[PDB]
Amino acid sequence: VEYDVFLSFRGPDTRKQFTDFLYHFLCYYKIHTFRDDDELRKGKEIGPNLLRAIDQSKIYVPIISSGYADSKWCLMELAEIVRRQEEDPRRIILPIFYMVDPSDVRHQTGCYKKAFRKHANKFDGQTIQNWKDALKKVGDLKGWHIGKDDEQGAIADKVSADIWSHISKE
Numbered sequence: 633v634e635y636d637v638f639l640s641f642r643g644p645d646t647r648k649q650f651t652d653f654l655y656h657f658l659c660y661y662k663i664h665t666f667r668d669d670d671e672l673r674k675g676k677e678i679g680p681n682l683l684r685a686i687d688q689s690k691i692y693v694p695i696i697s698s699g700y701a702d703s704k705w706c707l708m709e710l711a712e713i714v715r716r717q718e719e720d721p722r723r724i725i726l727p728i729f730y731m732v733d734p735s736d737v738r739h740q741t742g743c744y745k746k747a748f749r750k751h752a753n754k755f756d757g758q759t760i761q762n763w764k765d766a767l768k769k770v771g772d773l774k775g776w777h778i779g780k781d782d783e784q785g786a787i788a789d790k791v792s793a794d795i796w797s798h799i800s801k802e
């Protein structure tokens with residue numbers, strides 16, 4: 633009746649192409665998986681929808697993308713994930729790097745340079761340091777890298793069982 637999982641990704645790149653192959657596949661394990669596409673813009677943060685679903689979720693599984701550093705909504709939401717995680721470590725995080733090195737995620741360099749080059753002209757000089765402090769930790773947790781040659785299929789099947797293993801054995 634509630635959500636045992638919660639996703640997060642970049643809509644223009646993998647929302648209908650790659651992430652989708654995971655969601656349908658996951659529902660075949662008979663579990664409620666939550667995914668949203670609402671472009672928000674109704675304020676700056678919605679307590680009834682995004683904030684509630686987060687505290688209802690159990691296994692936060694973001695999916696870092698190449699452009700995971702441009703959307704003004706994604707990062708501020710990611711900061712709300714890992715921050716809530718550090719209070720109660722009963723839950724976990726299983727990131728999945730995708731078509732990006734596991735080196736341009738701990739230092740915001742590489743193909744993120746242009747992203748924070750322009751984001752520094754509008755927001756605070758401390759809020760940005762908060763994101764880079766939060767985004768760094770995600771790039772230290774365990775994660776399946778997806779090589780340009782890796783089967784988009786089998787990776788989905790294997791990563792599903794590891795999610796389903798933590799539920800059946802509890």
Ligand SMILES: Nc1ncnc2c1ncn2[C@@H]1O[C@H](CO)[C@H]2OP(=O)(O)O[C@H]21
Nearest residue numbers: 640641643668670671672703705706709
């Ligand atoms: N305009 C948008 N551009 C990109 N992603 C969006 C947009 N609006 C919403 N999202 C994403 O919808 C997801 C719902 O859980 C949420 O996960 P996220 O990674 O924080 O990016 C958000």
